[PDB]
Design a protein around this ligand. Structure first.
Ligand SMILES: C=C[C@@H]1C[C@]1(NC(=O)[C@@H]1C[C@@H](Oc2cc(-c3csc(NC(=O)C(C)C)n3)nc3c(Br)c(OC)ccc23)CN1C(=O)[C@@H](NC(=O)OC1CCCC1)C(C)(C)C)C(=O)O
Ligand code: NA
Lengths: 13, 182
């Protein structure tokens, strides 16, 4: 029942 | 290399455990790639045309914690190891590469950019080999052409004795097929 969680992000350039 | 990246963490151990249970994430979303976690594993999602795509061996059938509660997968293809959720609002949606370049760039969870040589539809050679441990946790990460468009997402590492010399990826073409079939 557990959700996947966003723990961070990556910014591109 | 042309393309560069950096990361920002948004949550820690406790907040992740809680958010996993409640399925509600109120954090503002940003970036082209989301760093994801479950109870056992970490992986990446690349957002392409309003959908954030990742691997089944990472997400299984799970929802993604969202601002309005859990988000149900929009696309689920166990045999291609591909799933996609509707992309949360602030997520920066990338554009599919259609010209197909020879030189590719793999973005890892560490926000390193690794040069790759395309070897076929879904395979790419590392120009210099890296430890497997270095790539672990980066499934779902984008392979980009120099222009910054997405050609595929990282699925599996080709390796021997803990050293990876190439990567297997899901081509954006596969994402087309799944969407159409649904
Ligand atoms: C080292 C990092 C690499 C990127 C990484 N990936 C991974 O860890 C992936 C996940 C798993 O590989 C696959 C799983 C599933 C899969 C589908 S469903 C499922 N699981 C379930 O249904 C469970 C509920 C049981 N697994 N489908 C695949 C498919 Br389709 C492929 O098609 C060409 C290729 C590999 C697949 C093993 N692996 C590998 O990278 C492994 N490599 C490997 O399998 O070699 C690849 C095969 C194609 C080219 C060479 C290894 C490094 C652990 C030895 C990661 O970080 O997770
Ligand atoms: Na970087």
């Amino acid at each position: 029942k557990g959700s996947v969680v966003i723990v961070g992000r990556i910014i591109l350039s | 290399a042309p393309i560069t990246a950096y990361s920002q963490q948004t949550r820690g151990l406790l907040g992740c455990i809680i958010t996993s249970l409640t399925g509600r994430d109120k954090n503002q979303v940003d970036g082209e790639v989301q760093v994801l976690s479950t109870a056992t594993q970490s992986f990446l999602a690349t957002c392409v045309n309003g959908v954030c795509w990742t691997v089944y061996h990472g997400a299984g059938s799970k929802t993604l914690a969202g601002p309005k509660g859990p988000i149900t997968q929009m696309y689920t293809n166990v045999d291609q190891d591909l799933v996609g959720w509707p992309a949360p609002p602030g997520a920066r949606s990338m554009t599919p590469c259609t010209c197909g370049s020879s030189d590719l760039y793999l973005v890892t969870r560490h926000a390193d950019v690794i040069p790759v040589r395309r070897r076929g539809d879904s395979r790419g050679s590392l120009l210099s080999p890296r430890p497997v441990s270095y790539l672990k946790g980066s499934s779902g990460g984008p392979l980009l052409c120099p222009s910054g468009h997405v050609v595929g997402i990282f699925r599996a590492a080709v390796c021997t004795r803990g050293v990876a010399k190439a990567v297997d990826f899901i081509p954006v073409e596969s994402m087309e097929t799944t969407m159409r079939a649904s």
